């Protein structure tokens, strides 16, 4: 432990954007934390982004407005940013920087965990093979989640992604036919969304078992950089030390990526596409990759990041890099929300990389993979038929195309469309899948092998 | 001996008192001694890309100088191991620390010095014999598959003075002794090679033998060759990692290195879970392919600067096992991640960028990396021939191939298995886009095809013609509708659909199509192309008649035959023997001919 | 079997041509060796120190 | 017929290879003769060094030429231990001429603690004060600097002019 | 030559040494007069003792054969012949047959493409498996068939079209590949 | 000649990518050459890119890896880069820097020539008018090459520009109403391509009249800045002094331009389009403009650069500036290559600016210009008609449009498509063009005068 | 009277001791007197755009100063003349040097003084 009296420097040299460029620092440490007493007594925090001799560039989390040159005082904590973590964090509400905002006491730490975490040794990382029964048909039957997955919800402004995430929270559970401790971290969200999620976890009895980090739209921008890391540090304490099964939700990774862009633009770092920093892949990886099971420890961390595709464009750097990093994406579609389908999940661009082992014989049922693949194929062909009928019209379609159109209609009506409080078991979802695939003769279900068709098709 | 850290800005660090430190020398930064490599050298200050997170490093920290470049310990104990970017064994770290993390600056050795390996010296060597770089002076029975040939290092030569008797030696034991110009050199089983320097070869032969994947669209339309360079550009979710892992599981390459460069962490555990259970039969005995697979993992969230080290270490290990005379195959899980690492380091250096921020030397780096791939006549006296195939997946941002990384990589590589997000979405896996993809080895390979699989060359030519014709018809059909199509054009469309659905797309996660032997592939294509030929003959010979045969009449008459052509894929090569599969395909051909004769 | 004599003949032929050339060059070298060496050595021994023209003051 | 054509092309490639060997071998013999001439020049300079008087007159010029090429205020002359008296005389005679010609003050020391290898033909290597700048004026260095430049003349003299070179411009 | 000059010349002397070693191993008696006559210009540097540095200097000056293409081709011919004579170890061949095989190899366009090389590879699969295999019925049968095959090759040579050897190759390879159980 | 001893500096002040900045250099000379003894004795060389007082920025050819301050000894040659040139450079394989890699001896300088060349007075640069019969109909019949011309082959990643170049090299010769010396500057070419070219020149037995400067992809990347200049210096020697007819093949001006960009980005100059130096026009001009003929001399230099256009974009600065400089371009088209048409030369975007004076009565044939113009016009109209067919279907096409599409198909099939080893003389190319123009009635062949239609059409 | 070459970078020379030089004034750079035009001034250092290849110019080379801007001779002899970009007569250079090359720093009067 650090037994030395920390140094307080009033030697600010320059201030520029979110950066206070301190001078005459003695043995500065990169990534060290600094506590800034402004002239008027207001206290802020900052992270040393760069050290050069006796200089130290402190990126202030709350912003540099009001910072003086001769009067601001900066005490150097001598240590990287550490979060106090204890199981008591379950059932609390903290703000973006981990300070309680529920009129409870500051966390009485069980440990002081580095906010940045450490990468799990890929040799001792255990592959997620246990299925979460989210209850959503569009997920369980066709994008099955595994306990330990990074599977964000790709959505857009105004879409139901909040409702889908809350539903997944309330009805997520293993397909054994234990409760998830939830760590939620909202960034740049509006008070409406903060109230929505808090009131949901209270409407359920879950709030006793939920930890919330809140960084509202009016809260500091630079603090959204550390809010995900606080949440995931708490999740890692719970999962890899307390052996909880933790579900981590990170709301508006878009409002995180924009904070990252602001910091990188202030630093004038090399930009990627559409202005975002060059290392956004690495940074979003540092966030997302803090998920999955581990060897010898019974806990897990299931992430469901929620990010608003800007202009509904999946190629935008945020969704693109999140798709590269994460093990899937559940796609929320305006073209379904406009038709008032809930959940408006577009299975066709949805994906779940760990389905391939979360489903099969043993866990869930042995027709799961065949049904999923054939539903995907039939849905794609139904979209093709819809596209062509707009050109040629109904009068020029063959009976096979009409079969595909009927399948598409009944598939969105019965399979996708679902009650916001309805928990369909994987078996109910698969039975619906078969009731839809029976629209077709065996010969047009070209994915399913005959050993599966002759066993499940007739019923 | 020591420099002092003068500044920290990320992976880049600047150090005082580094008076004569060479470019790309290897240094230890910090009290934890994070490894790092000098990349600029101004005044008496060196700039260092640190291969481990520098958060916590402070000005004044020591920067110890090791006078050696980034190098790897090449020796027994590689196969079946998983290494981090700079060749620290992750299993050894886990055993030593008994913790689930990679402590910063852990200094564990790359190869165990405690395991006793059986050593059988080359029988002909004796004290006094002349020996040169690449010469094999013994063999280690590392495991059932890999007879690990110990070789003199390149740049080592002279007269032998002691060759260790056959027996059990640990990697630190002196196994050979030689002398040149009177200077005496003791050689253990382990050599050290700088990863940035090409391991020399006597010659680089033409690549003339295919690298059989398990994937039909790859083996047939776009072949790669042992010693060939390949790329797999595709947007996220197009299955490039799955193609790489299937090529790693099932291929005719004696050794495989999977260089895990900056991609998802769970995939290395996927490999470590799958490969031990996957087995290949050698001498009638089943052996796990992990005994011939080696892994280098630098996942996305592990230090960025180490992705470059991961790539170079992978290619160096592959070159080592190529020097043994093996046909190694290296899978670079994403070279765009390494390109992004170069971009980030360049930004920290404040260099002027090329397109989209990449350094001007990105093309040169990619070229020098891919150029280490050819089939070679290995160094040393026992005349040996090896290969290092390279399969570098590319992760173009936004799923477009105008990306600078993909543009360069396509300027460098010889095979391009472009993947299509719109096929991946439909689940048309493998998502190879058959129109833009290509393989420049299709000529070098015909010498092999025309004597092992004679008919396959014309079969492939006609298949590509069919698909191109269907592509031409797609635009007309979309804007005019199917009503205008000729009767032969209907058959082209429908047989193209048959090839797409039942020859090209191959579900790699099923027993029947995880591996599709080339005999199965050529037989399947022969059946489909033969159906195409007979259908066109039937339509063309009766189009002038009053009793015209039409695609509708064929479809109605041959529902069973079309479904059999669609079910050909389901045949299981191991549950159903080669003999049964070939017999069944011939029987389907007979059925098709019978039905055509009974229809016309 | 008859044509192998093609190499059997032209190898010796080209060797003979090379031998003639490697005698011609040697003869010319022997004719001009000394008078080249005297110039080379005289030019070496002729030093003539000079300052760089751009020098000032 | 395609087999026969391929055999004829094998004759083509093999005769090309044989002709390439012949050409490169005659070229290598020519280069070996050039190397023999340069070795003879090296031996001749080693002999010239034996004649002390002419060696003294040569060292005077070599030393002064090094001083002129450096134009430093402090310089260190490194020589073979065998030549040390001659190099001392050369430096003692060079300093006045250096001062008169350059108008610069100069301090020239001899590197008594570190001599050139005795294998050297002769000459001197002059370092600036801090030994980060060197001017090499060993007889081997002069011989190479001159010979590599004179190769066109040596080629033309030994092996005659090129008939095909119709212009020198 | 794609190598540095120093590495190239060390490779040249390495090849000379390896040719010497292969000759000394295949013919420890000095009986293969034709082969030794052909390899005189490379064998001399070992039949007359030299140091590595002496042979390297001679290679650099061009006194030794110093063309790695020729040295590699010749060393490969000798290596394959040694592989044959060694894989036939218990059934030493006739000297006339050895010389005929050597000439057949020498006249081949590219040995690595050669049917001879493939046949030797198959024989080596058999021999290397039997060098370790335990005495289970499969391995006893392979030992018997492989000894018969080695004896037959000792009489007929792998450069010929002997159908007995061809069929025994096929059948023994099938026995090897077939599962143990 | 230079008698004064060379100066060696252990004064290295910095190392930065390809550069090595020296300080305290005595009267530095711009464009001077330096020989760098590294600490381990490895010898490299560099060219001074600029001087400022006592400084000197040495761009090292063999790269700067391993170089260090305080021990790397830079010996200043006192002279600009002069290469040794000899006629017996024919039949040799040199690396990028002009050092043997065929195990022959280094060039015994017949002379020393500054590799930057010497500008030829425009008053006395003869205008080339002798057609080179490349044997490829798509060049001879519509883009003919005059002996003394610069005519790059614009291509793209994956196309057979190497095959086209080799065919030109082995088939090129003056029209028969004299043999070429090839100088082949490979830059950034992979071993496959280098071996292909070397093997082709050996296979056609031409090696005694070929000189290769191979800078492979794995060779140092700054060395290709001097490789093409070395090649052109050898070609100028052979042509303007040895009176030969020299054909120069520069393999990848894109690789050379990327070497330029690397040097520029290391120097931190103000960058031009796409990151290339602003002076790339002049620096490519100094490479291309060394073709041509001169008065008094009988020798000539034909120049055929090869360009890999990034993203097939002809607007890319490399091909754009090379088109501004060189007298035309032969454009290899990915679409024709995909449709399996060799050579893929697309005659629409390709032109040879000296064809007009190279062709005509008394040189090739009276009808050459008319036939080329009419083939071009018919092909362009056929491309437009094809684009219409692809949009509105074939039933809207008149008889004229059907004739144009028949012509287009048969033109790509008979006139462009050609055997790689088939060398169609100019007359055979012209007759294969007349057979195609015969598809149209004389009333539609507008660009051919009646006085030539009456003579050539009816046959 | 004259300055000195203080640096070189392609055509952009830099000359010290150019105290009173004027913008776009002509300078002769190097011992071969390559024509150059002052394009910038900084203190007593003047940056020069050199009109000929600078490869070989060295620090310390004199930079002679001519007090006139880039100027063209106008008079008899222009008609039928073929000029370089800066008024050098190419035909007269050829007829004078009897060579096919432009010598660097070649200085021949633009309009012949020998014609009556």
Curated annotation (Swiss-Prot), chains A, F:
Superkingdom of the source species: Eukaryota
Record key words, sorted: ATP-binding, Cell membrane, Cytoplasm, Cytoplasmic vesicle, Hydrogen ion transport, Ion transport, Membrane, Nucleotide-binding, Synapse, Transport
Record carries keyword Nucleotide-binding: yes
Compartment annotation: Apical cell membrane; Melanosome; Cytoplasm; Cytoplasmic vesicle, Secretory vesicle, Synaptic vesicle membrane
Binding of ATP, residues: 353
Molecular function terms from GO: ATP binding; proton-transporting ATPase activity, rotational mechanism
Keyword Ion transport: yes
Annotated InterPro entries: ATP-synt_VA_C, ATPase_a/bsu_AS, ATPase_F1/V1/A1_a/bsu_N, ATPase_F1/V1/A1_a/bsu_nucl-bd, ATPase_V1-cplx_bsu, P-loop_NTPase, V-ATPase_su_B/beta
Summary of the tissues where the protein is detected: Expressed in brain (at protein level).
Annotated GO biological process: ATP metabolic process; regulation of cellular pH; synaptic vesicle lumen acidification; vacuolar acidification
GO cellular component, as recorded: apical plasma membrane; clathrin-coated vesicle membrane; cytoplasm; cytosol; extrinsic component of synaptic vesicle membrane; melanosome; microvillus; plasma membrane
UniProt xrefs under PROSITE patterns: ATPASE_ALPHA_BETA (PS00152)
One Pfam family in the UniProt entry: ATP-synt_ab_N
Membrane-topology descriptor: Peripheral membrane protein
Known function: Non-catalytic subunit of the V1 complex of vacuolar(H+)-ATPase (V-ATPase), a multisubunit enzyme composed of a peripheral complex (V1) that hydrolyzes ATP and a membrane integral complex (V0) that translocates protons. V-ATPase is responsible for acidifying and maintaining the pH of intracellular compartments and in some cell types, is targeted to the plasma membrane, where it is responsible for acidifying the extracellular environment.
Homology family: Belongs to the ATPase alpha/beta chains family.
SUBUNIT field: V-ATPase is a heteromultimeric enzyme made up of two complexes: the ATP-hydrolytic V1 complex and the proton translocation V0 complex. The V1 complex consists of three catalytic AB heterodimers that form a heterohexamer, three peripheral stalks each consisting of EG heterodimers, one central rotor including subunits D and F, and the regulatory subunits C and H. The proton translocation complex V0 consists of the proton transport subunit a, a ring of proteolipid subunits c9c'', rotary subunit d, subunits e and f, and the accessory subunits ATP6AP1/Ac45 and ATP6AP2/PRR.
Protein name as catalogued: V-type proton ATPase subunit B, brain isoform
Organism encoding this protein: Rattus norvegicus (Rat)
Gene of this entry: Atp6v1b2
UniProtKB/Swiss-Prot annotation, chain D:
Signal sequence interval, chain numbering: none
UniProt keyword Acyltransferase present: no
Cell location: Apical cell membrane; Cytoplasmic vesicle, Secretory vesicle, Synaptic vesicle membrane; Cytoplasmic vesicle, Clathrin-coated vesicle membrane
One Gene Ontology term of the molecular function aspect: ATPase binding
Known tissue expression: Expressed in brain (at protein level).
One GO location term (cellular component): clathrin-coated vesicle membrane
Protein origin, superkingdom: Eukaryota
Membrane topology: Peripheral membrane protein
GO biological process terms on file: proton transmembrane transport; synaptic vesicle lumen acidification
Main location: membrane
Key word Oxidoreductase present: no
Keywords for this protein: Acetylation, Cell membrane, Cytoplasmic vesicle, Hydrogen ion transport, Ion transport, Membrane, Phosphoprotein, Synapse, Transport
Similarity annotation: Belongs to the V-ATPase E subunit family.
Function: Subunit of the V1 complex of vacuolar(H+)-ATPase (V-ATPase), a multisubunit enzyme composed of a peripheral complex (V1) that hydrolyzes ATP and a membrane integral complex (V0) that translocates protons. V-ATPase is responsible for acidifying and maintaining the pH of intracellular compartments and in some cell types, is targeted to the plasma membrane, where it is responsible for acidifying the extracellular environment.
Record note on quaternary structure: V-ATPase is a heteromultimeric enzyme made up of two complexes: the ATP-hydrolytic V1 complex and the proton translocation V0 complex. The V1 complex consists of three catalytic AB heterodimers that form a heterohexamer, three peripheral stalks each consisting of EG heterodimers, one central rotor including subunits D and F, and the regulatory subunits C and H. The proton translocation complex V0 consists of the proton transport subunit a, a ring of proteolipid subunits c9c'', rotary subunit d, subunits e and f, and the accessory subunits ATP6AP1/Ac45 and ATP6AP2/PRR.
Protein name: V-type proton ATPase subunit E 1
């Amino acid at each position: 432990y650090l037994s030395q009296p920390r140094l307080t420097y009033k030697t600010v040299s320059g201030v520029n954007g979110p950066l206070v460029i301190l001078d005459h620092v003695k043995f500065p440490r990169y990534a060290e934390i600094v506590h800034l007493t402004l002239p008027d007594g207001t206290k802020r925090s900052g992270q040393v982004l760069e050290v050069s001799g006796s200089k130290a560039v402190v990126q202030v989390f709350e912003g540099t407005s009001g910072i003086d040159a001769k009067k601001t005082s900066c005490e150097f904590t001598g240590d990287i940013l550490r979060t106090p973590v204890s199981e008591d964090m379950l059932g609390r509400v903290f703000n973006g920087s981990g300070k309680p905002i529920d009129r409870g006491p500051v966390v009485l730490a069980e440990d002081f965990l580095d906010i940045m975490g450490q990468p799990i040794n890929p040799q001792c990382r255990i592959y997620p093979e246990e299925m979460i029964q989210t209850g959503i048909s569009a997920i369980d039957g066709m994008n099955s989640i595994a306990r330990g997955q990074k599977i964000p919800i790709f959505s857009a402004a105004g879409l139901p992604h909040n409702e889908i995430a809350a539903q997944i929270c309330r009805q997520a559970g293993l397909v054994k036919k234990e409760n998830f401790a939830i760590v939620f971290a909202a960034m740049g969200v509006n008070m409406e969304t903060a109230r929505f999620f808090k009131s949901d976890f209270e409407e359920n009895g879950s709030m006793d078992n939920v930890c919330l980090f809140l960084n509202l739209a009016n809260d500091p921008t630079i603090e959204r950089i550390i809010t995900p890391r606080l949440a995931l540090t708490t999740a890692e304490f719970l999962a890899y030390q307390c052996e909880k099964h933790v579900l981590v939700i990170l709301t508006d990774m878009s409002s995180y990526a924009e904070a990252l862009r602001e910091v990188s633009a202030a630093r004038e770092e090399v930009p990627g596409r559409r202005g975002f920093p060059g290392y956004m892949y690495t940074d979003l990886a540092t966030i997302y990759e803090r998920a999955g099971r581990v060897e010898g420890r019974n806990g897990s961390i299931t992430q469901i990041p929620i990010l608003t595709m800007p202009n509904d464009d999946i190629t935008h750097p945020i969704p693109d890099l999140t798709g590269y990093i994460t093990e899937g994406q559940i796609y929320v579609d305006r073209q379904l929300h406009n038709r008032q389908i809930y959940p408006p999940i577009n299975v066709l661009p949805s994906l779940s990389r760990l389905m391939k082992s979360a489903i099969g014989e043993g866990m869930t049922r042995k027709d799961h993979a065949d049904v999923s693949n054939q539903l995907y194929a039939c849905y794609a062909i139904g979209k093709d038929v819809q596209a062509m009928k707009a050109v040629v019209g109904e009068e020029a379609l063959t009976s096979d195309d009409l079969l595909y159109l009927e399948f598409l209609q009944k598939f969105e009506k019965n399979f996708i469309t679902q009650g916001p409080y309805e928990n369909r078991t994987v078996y109910e979802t698969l039975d619906i899948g078969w009731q839809l695939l029976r629209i077709f003769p065996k010969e047009m279900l070209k994915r399913i092998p005959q050993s599966t068709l002759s066993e499940f098709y007739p019923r | 001996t020591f420099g002092y850290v003068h500044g920290v800005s990320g992976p880049v660090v600047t150090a005082c008192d580094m008076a004569g430190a060479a470019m790309y020398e290897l240094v230890r930064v910090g009290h934890s001694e994070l490894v790092g490599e000098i990349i600029r050298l101004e005044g008496d200050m060196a700039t260092i890309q640190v291969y481990e997170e520098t958060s916590g490093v402070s000005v004044g920290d020591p920067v110890l100088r090791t006078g050696k470049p980034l190098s790897v310990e090449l020796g027994p104990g590689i196969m079946g191991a998983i290494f981090d970017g700079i060749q620290r064994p992750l299993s050894d770290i886990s055993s030593q620390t008994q913790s689930i993390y990679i402590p910063r600056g852990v200094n564990v050795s790359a190869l165990s010095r405690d395991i006793k390996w059986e050593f059988i010296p080359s029988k002909n060597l004796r004290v006094g014999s002349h020996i040169t770089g690449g010469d094999i002076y013994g063999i280690v029975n590392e495991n059932s598959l890999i007879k690990h040939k110990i070789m003199l290092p390149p740049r080592s030569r002279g007269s032998v003075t002691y060759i260790a008797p056959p027996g059990n030696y640990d990697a630190s034991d002196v196994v050979l002794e030689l002398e040149f110009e009177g200077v005496k050199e003791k050689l253990s089983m382990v050599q050290v090679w700088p990863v940035r320097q090409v391991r020399p070869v006597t010659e680089k032969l033409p690549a003339n033998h295919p690298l059989l994947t398990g994937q039909r669209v790859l083996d047939a339309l776009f072949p790669c060759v042992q010693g060939g360079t390949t790329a797999i550009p595709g947007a996220f979710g197009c299955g490039k990692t799955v193609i790489s892992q299937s090529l790693s599981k099932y291929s005719n390459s004696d050794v495989i290195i999977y260089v895990g460069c900056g991609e998802r962490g769970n995939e290395m555990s996927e490999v470590l879970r799958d490969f031990p259970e996957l087995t290949m039969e050698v001498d009638g005995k089943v052996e796990s392919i992990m005994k011939r697979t080696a892994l280098v993992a630098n996942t996305s969230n592990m230090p960025v600067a180490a992705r470059e080290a991961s790539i170079y270490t992978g290619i160096t290990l592959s070159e080592y096992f190529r020097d043994m005379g093996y046909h190694v195959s290296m899978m670079a899980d994403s070279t765009s991640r390494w390109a992004e690492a170069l971009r980030e380091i360049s930004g920290r250096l404040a260099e002027m960028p090329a397109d989209s921020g990449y350094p001007a030397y990105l093309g040169a780096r990619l070229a020098s990396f891919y150029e280490r791939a050819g089939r070679v006549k290995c160094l040393g006296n026992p005349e040996r021939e090896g290969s290092v195939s390279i399969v570098g997946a590319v992760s173009p941002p936004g799923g477009d191939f105008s990306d600078p990384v993909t543009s360069a990589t396509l300027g460098i590589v010889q095979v391009f298995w472009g993947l299509d997000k719109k096929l991946a979405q439909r689940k048309h896996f493998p998502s190879v886009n058959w129109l833009i993809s290509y393989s420049k080895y299709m000529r070098a390979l015909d010498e092999y095809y025309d004597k092992h699989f004679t008919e396959f060359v014309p079969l492939r030519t006609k298949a590509k013609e069919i698909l191109q014709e269907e592509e031409d018809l797609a635009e007309i059909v979309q804007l005019v509708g199917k009503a205008s199509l000729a009767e032969t054009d209907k058959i082209t469309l429908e047989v193209a659909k048959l090839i797409k659905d039942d020859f090209l797309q191959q579900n790699g996660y099923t027993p029947y199509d995880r591996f599709c032997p080339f005999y199965k592939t050529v037989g399947m294509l022969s059946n489909m192309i033969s159906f195409y030929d007979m259908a066109r003959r039937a339509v063309e010979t009766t189009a002038q008649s009053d009793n015209k045969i039409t695609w509708s009449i064929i479809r109605e008459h041959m529902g069973e035959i079309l479904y059999k052509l669609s079910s050909m894929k389901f045949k299981d090569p191991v549950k159903d023997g080669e003999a049964k599969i070939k017999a069944d395909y011939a029987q389907l051909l007979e059925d098709m001919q019978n039905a055509f004769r009974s229809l016309e | 079997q008859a044509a192998m004599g093609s190499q059997g003949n032209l190898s010796a032929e080209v060797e003979q041509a090379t031998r003639r050339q490697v005698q011609g060059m040697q003869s010319s070298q022997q004719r001009n060796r000394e008078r080249v060496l005297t110039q080379l050595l005289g030019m070496v021994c002729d030093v003539r120190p000079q300052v760089h023209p751009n020098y000032r003051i | 017929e395609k087999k026969e054509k391929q055999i004829e092309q094998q004759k083509k490639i093999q005769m090309s290879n044989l002709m390439n060997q012949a050409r490169l071998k005659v070229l290598r013999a020519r280069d070996d003769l050039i190397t023999d001439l340069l070795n003879e020049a090296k031996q001749r300079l080693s002999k010239v060094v034996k004649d002390t008087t002419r060696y003294q007159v040569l060292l005077d010029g070599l030393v002064l030429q090094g001083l002129y090429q450096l134009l430093e205020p402090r310089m260190i002359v490194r020589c073979r231990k065998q030549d040390f008296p001659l190099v001392k005389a050369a430096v003692q005679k060079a300093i006045p001429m250096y001062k008169i010609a350059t108008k610069k003050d100069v301090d020239v020391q001899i590197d008594l603690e570190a001599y050139l290898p005795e294998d050297i033909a002769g000459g001197v290597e002059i370092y600036n004060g801090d030994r980060k700048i060197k001017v090499s004026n060993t007889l081997e260095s002069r011989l190479d600097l001159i010979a590599q430049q004179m190769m066109p003349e040596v080629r033309g003299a030994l092996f005659g002019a090129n008939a095909n070179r119709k212009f020198l411009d | 030559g794609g190598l540095t000059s120093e590495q190239y010349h060390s490779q040249v002397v390495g090849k000379i040494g390896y040719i010497a070693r292969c000759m000394q191993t295949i013919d420890p008696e000095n009986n293969l007069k034709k082969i030794r006559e052909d390899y005189q210009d490379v064998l001399i540097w070992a039949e007359k003792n030299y140091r590595f540095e002496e042979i390297l200097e001679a290679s650099k000056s061009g006194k030794c054969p110093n063309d790695l293409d020729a040295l590699s081709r010749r060393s490969l011919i000798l290596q394959e012949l040694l592989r044959l004579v060694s894989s036939i170890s218990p059934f030493k061949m006739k000297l006339d047959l050895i010389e005929s095989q050597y000439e057949k190899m020498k006249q081949h366009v590219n040995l690595w493409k050669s049917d001879y090389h493939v046949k030797l590879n198959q024989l080596n699969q058999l021999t290397d498996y039997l060098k370790n295999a335990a005495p289970t019925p499969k391995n006893n049968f392979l030992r018997a068939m492989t000894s018969v095959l080695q004896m037959q090759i000792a009489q007929y040579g792998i450069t010929e079209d002997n159908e007995g050897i061809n069929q025994l190759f096929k059948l023994g390879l099938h026995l090897l590949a077939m599962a143990n159980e």
